[PDB]
C-alpha cells in the first residue's frame, strides 16, 4: 500500500518537537517513517541537502497535492518582513503559506507553533507568532507543549489516517484526548492539595513525601494537558511533578515562559 505523505517545516524551532519522535514507542520513529507514513520532507532526517532537498519539497508538494498533512514546528517571526528565519533565501512564512495551500490537514506541533511559545515571550525580539495567525483562513490542529508527548501528535495523525478525519478538538483546536482537562483536575497529588499537605522547599520533609507542589509554583491548576496521565517516555511514573518539580505551564499561553517558576497559580 501507499503510505500517507507528511511534510514537516521547521521555523523558529529548538528541534525539541522532532526529538520527541525519537522517544516515541507507538509508533517508534523507525516504524513511523518505514510503515505508518511517508515523511516526504524533514530537514533533520533527510539524506538530501540544499538544492536536492528543495527539489524533494516541490516534488512532494505537487505529487501529493491535496493529500499530505503539513506539520509546522516553531514560531513564525513577522518583524522586519520575515528576515529572522530564512531558508534557501526566502522568509519561512513564504515556505509555510505555499505548503499550506496543498495541505489535507495542518498541524502546529509544540507551544511555539501553537501560540508563539518561548520565542514570543518577553519583549518578543523577532515578532514571533503562532501558526494560526499566519494561516488565518485555515483550521489548524494545535498540539502544544514544549515539546508535547510525541503520541499527542502521533495519535492525532493516526486518527486522520485510520478514520479519515481529525480527532475531536476543543475551542483552541487542541485534541480533547490530550488537552481536554486541566492537569490539576486529573493530578495524583490533588489529595495532598485538599489536605493542605504542601512542599515548601525542594528537599524538605513534605517534598520528600511526594506532597503537592502548588507552593513551589505548580501551574497545573491553569494548564490543560495529559502530563499526569499519559506522562512521558512510556516507562511509567515520569512527568515533572512526579519527579519533584512543579508544572511550569509550558502547554498553556500566558502561563509557560510568562509566569515565574515560583510564581503561584493564583498570582498574575
Amino acid at each position: 500500500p501507499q503510505r500517507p505523505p507528511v511534510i514537516w517545516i521547521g521555523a523558529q524551532e529548538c528541534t525539541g518537537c522532532t526529538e520527541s519522535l525519537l522517544r516515541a514507542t507507538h509508533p517508534t520513529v523507525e516504524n513511523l517513517v518505514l510503515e505508518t507514513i511517508s515523511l516526504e520532507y524533514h530537514e533533520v532526517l533527510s539524506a538530501a541537502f540544499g538544492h536536492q532537498v528543495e527539489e524533494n519539497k516541490h516534488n512532494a508538494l505537487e505529487k501529493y497535492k491535496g493529500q499530505y498533512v503539513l506539520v509546522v514546528d516553531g514560531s513564525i517571526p513577522l518583524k522586519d518582513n520575515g528576515i529572522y528565519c530564512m531558508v534557501a533565501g526566502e522568509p519561512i512564512v513564504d515556505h509555510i503559506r505555499r505548503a499550506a495551500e496543498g495541505a489535507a490537514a495542518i498541524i502546529a506541533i509544540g507551544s511555539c507553533a501553537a501560540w508563539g511559545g518561548v520565542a514570543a515571550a518577553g519583549v518578543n525580539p523577532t515578532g514571533a507568532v503562532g501558526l494560526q495567525e499566519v494561516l488565518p483562513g485555515k483550521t489548524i490542529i494545535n498540539i502544544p507543549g514544549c515539546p508535547p508527548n510525541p503520541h499527542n501528535f502521533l495519535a492525532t495523525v493516526a486518527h486522520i489516517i485510520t478514520y479519515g478525519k481529525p480527532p475531536k478538538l476543543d475551542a483552541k483546536n487542541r485534541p480533547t484526548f490530550a488537552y481536554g482537562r486541566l492537569i490539576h483536575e486529573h493530578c495524583e497529588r490533588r489529595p495532598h492539595f485538599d489536605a493542605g499537605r504542601f512542599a515548601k522547599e525542594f528537599g524538605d520533609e513534605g517534598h520528600r513525601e511526594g506532597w503537592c507542589l502548588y507552593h513551589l509554583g505548580c501551574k497545573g491548576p491553569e494548564t490543560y494537558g495529559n502530563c499526569s496521565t499519559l506522562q512521558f517516555c512510556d516507562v511509567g511514573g515520569v512527568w515533572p511533578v512526579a519527579i519533584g518539580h512543579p508544572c511550569y505551564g509550558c502547554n498553556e499561553e500566558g502561563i509557560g515562559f510568562h509566569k515565574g517558576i515560583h510564581q503561584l497559580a493564583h498570582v498574575e
Partner: protein
C-alpha cells in the same frame, strides 16, 4: 570563480547556509551562515535568576539538558553556591546519558548517510556482510538473518516508490566508497542505534521528569527528592529502574558504534587528511564529584598550534585564565556592536543587513580566546585529555586505531586526528568513556544515600540590591558551553550564552580570521558542484546545531 550555496544544510539541527568558492574542483574559500535568530538572551532579561534555566533550555532540544545545567551553574556562580554533591551526581548522570543518546544519533541518524549509500546496500549479500564482522565485533545482532531483515525493509521502501527522507540522496555519487556489504552493515546499525539511544533517554527521563527538556533542576541543586523509603519520590525502586537502562547502553556503544567508526575510517583514509578546522582547541573540565563544584571526572584545557605539548590544563570552572580570555565579535555578523565583547558586557542588538561577502553574513557571533579562533567539541576534548595523559582516553583511542589497523594494516597518528575523521573519532571516544561515567556516578549516588546524605537542594540567597556576576561552564556534546549572567537588584540585567557551535560555526572575526567550519572546507574536493557531498561530510563532522549557535 565558481560559487555554490548549500541552503539548507540538512541533517543538523536548525538553519544553516554554507557558501563556497570553487577553484579547479577544490573549494578555495567558504562562508558559514546561521540564518535564524530568536533572541533568547533578550527574552530571559529582567527575570528572577531562578527562572532562567527553564527558559534558556529552549535554546535547543537536540542538546537538551545542556543549557539548563549551564544556566543554573551560572546563577550558582553568581551567588557563590556550593552544589550539594547528590545534585551533582544527578546532573552528571543526566548529562552523560543525554550525551550518549546525542552522539549515537549524530553518528547514525545525522551523519551516516554522508558515507553510506542505501541503493548499494540493496545489492549486498547478507551472508558475506555478516562474515566480514567475524572476529571484528562480538555484537549479537550482526547475523546474516538480521541483515536480510534490514535489507528487505529497504527493499520494500524503495519498491513503494516513496523513499521519503531517503529520496534523492547522493546515491551512486563517486565519493561513496563503501562496498554493498558495508553499506548494509551500516544501515542495520543505523536501525539498531535507535533502540540504544531510546534507552539512554529513559535514564534521562527518570531523573529529569521527561526528555526533551528536563525539569528537575534548580539554582541550588535539583528537585529530585531522595528518600529510599518514600512513596512517589526518588526511592530505591526508581534508582534500580534507572540502573536497568544504564546497563543497556555499553554493548551497542562498544561493539557497534565504536567498531563502525573504525570501518568508516578504513574505507575513507583520505578523510584523515582534510577537514582540519583550527590549530587551537578548548574544552572545560566536566562532571564535578565534590560538594564544592569541583573534582571533575573529565579534564579540560587549552591547546595551541596543533601541538599537544602546549597543553594548559583547566581544572576549575572558576579559573580566571579561562574566564578572562573569552570574547565575541559581530564584525561580520548581523548585530550592531562589532568590537570584541566579554560576555558579561555582551550586547545582542539585531542589525540585519542582508548577505555580504565582505560584510555581515550570519546571525552567529564570532568567539575568540585571547584573540584566537578555536575549535570546540569532541576533537578538542579528546586532544586535551590525550595531552593530559589520561590513560582511559589513550586506551580507548587505541582500541579504535587497532580495529582500523586490523582492517587496513595502516595506522593513525595523532597528526591525522586534526581532520574530519579525527573529529568523528573524538566523538566516539567521548561516548565510550561516558559509559564509565554513568556507572561511576550511579554507584557514587547509591553509596552516598546509604551514608545518610539525602540533601539535594540549598536555597539561594538572592540580594534585592547589588550587582553579581556569574559564569556556568559545561562540556556539552558539541563542546565548551558557557552561560554568563549578571544580576542587578534581584533580577537579570544581562545574559549572554556562548555556545559550542557558536565557536565552530562563527563567521570571520574582528581580525578577519575565518571560523572553524570555514577553515575546514578549504581544500575539499568537489566531484559535483551541484551535489557537494564532500562539503556536507566535513560540516557534519562538527555536529552543527544552529539554534545553539545563534540562540
Amino acid at each position: 570563480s565558481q560559487r555554490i550555496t548549500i541552503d539548507p544544510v540538512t541533517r543538523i539541527e536548525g538553519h544553516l547556509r554554507i557558501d563556497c568558492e570553487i577553484e579547479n574542483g577544490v573549494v578555495s574559500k567558504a562562508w558559514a551562515s546561521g540564518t535564524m535568530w530568536r533572541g533568547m538572551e533578550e527574552i530571559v532579561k529582567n527575570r528572577d535568576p531562578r527562572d532562567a534555566w527553564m527558559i534558556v533550555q529552549r535554546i535547543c532540544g537536540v542538546c537538551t539538558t545542556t543549557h539548563a545545567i549551564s544556566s543554573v551553574r551560572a546563577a550558582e556562580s553568581a551567588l557563590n553556591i556550593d552544589v550539594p554533591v547528590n545534585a551533582q551526581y544527578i546532573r552528571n548522570i543526566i548529562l552523560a546519558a543525554h550525551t550518549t543518546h546525542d552522539h549515537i544519533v549524530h553518528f547514525y541518524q545525522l551523519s551516516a548517510l554522508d558515507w553510506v549509500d542505501i541503493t548499494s546496500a540493496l545489492k549486498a549479500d547478507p551472508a558475506k556482510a555478516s562474515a566480514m564482522l567475524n572476529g571484528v565485533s562480538t555484537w549479537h545482532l550482526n547475523s546474516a538473518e538480521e541483515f536480510t531483515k534490514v535489507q528487505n525493509k529497504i527493499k520494500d521502501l524503495v519498491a513503494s516508490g516513496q523513499l521519503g527522507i531517503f529520496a534523492n540522496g547522493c546515491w551512486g555519487h563517486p565519493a561513496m566508497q563503501l562496498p554493498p556489504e558495508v553499506n548494509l552493515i551500516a544501515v542495520a546499525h543505523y536501525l539498531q542505534a535507535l533502540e540504544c539511544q531510546r534507552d539512554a533517554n529513559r535514564v534521562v527521563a527518570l531523573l529529569g521528569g521527561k526528555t526533551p527538556h528536563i525539569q528537575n533542576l534548580a539554582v541550588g541543586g535539583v528537585a529530585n527528592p531522595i528518600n529510599l523509603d518514600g512513596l512517589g519520590v526518588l526511592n530505591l525502586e526508581r534508582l534500580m529502574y534507572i540502573k536497568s537502562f544504564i546497563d543497556k547502553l555499553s554493548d551497542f556503544v562498544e561493539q557497534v558504534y565504536k567498531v563502525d567508526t573504525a570501518v568508516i575510517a578504513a574505507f575513507y583514509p583520505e578523510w584523515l587528511e582534510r577537514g582540519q578546522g583550527a590549530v587551537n582547541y578548548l574544552s572545560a573540565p566536566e562532571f564535578p564529584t565534590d560538594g564544592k563544584n569541583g573534582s571533575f571526572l573529565f579534564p579540560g584545557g587549552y591547546i595551541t598550534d596543533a601541538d599537544l605539548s602546549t597543553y594548559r590544563p583547566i581544572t576549575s570552572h572558576s579559573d580566571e585564565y579561562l574566564i578572562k580570555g573569552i570574547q565575541e565579535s559581530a564584525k561580520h555578523a548581523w548585530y550592531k556592536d562589532e568590537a570584541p565583547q566579554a560576555p558579561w558586557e555582551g550586547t545582542t542588538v539585531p542589525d540585519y543587513t542582508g548577505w555580504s561577502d565582505d560584510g555581515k553574513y550570519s546571525w552567529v557571533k564570532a568567539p575568540t580566546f585571547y584573540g584566537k579562533t578555536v575549535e570546540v567539541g569532541p576533537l578538542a576534548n579528546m586532544l586535551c585529555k590525550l595531552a593530559a595523559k589520561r590513560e582511559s582516553t589513550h586506551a580507548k583511542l587505541n582500541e579504535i586505531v587497532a580495529i582500523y589497523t586490523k582492517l587496513t594494516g595502516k595506522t593513525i597518528e595523532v597528526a591525522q586526528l586534526h581532520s574530519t575523521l579525527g573529529r568523528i573519532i573524538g566523538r566516539t571516544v567521548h561516548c565510550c568513556e561516558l559509559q564509565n561515567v554513568l556507572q561511576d556516578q550511579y554507584n557514587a549516588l547509591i553509596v552516598n544515600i546509604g551514608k545518610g546524605d539525602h540533601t539535594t537542594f540549598v536555597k539561594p540567597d538572592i540580594p534585592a540590591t547589588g550587582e553579581f556576576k556569574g559564569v556556568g561552564f559545561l562540556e556539552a556534546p558539541r563542546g565548551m558551553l558557557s552561560h554568563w549572567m549578571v544580576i542587578k537588584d534581584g533580577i537579570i540585567s544581562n545574559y549572554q550564552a556562548v555556545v559550542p557551535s557558536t565557536w565552530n560555526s562563527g563567521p570571520r572575526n574582528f581580525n578577519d580570521e575565518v571560523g572553524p567550519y570555514e577553515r575546514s572546507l578549504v581544500g575539499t574536493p568537489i566531484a559535483d558542484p551541484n551535489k557537494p557531498l564532500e562539503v556536507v561530510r566535513t560540516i557534519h563532522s562538527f555536529d552543527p546545531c544552529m539554534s545553539c549557535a545563534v540562540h
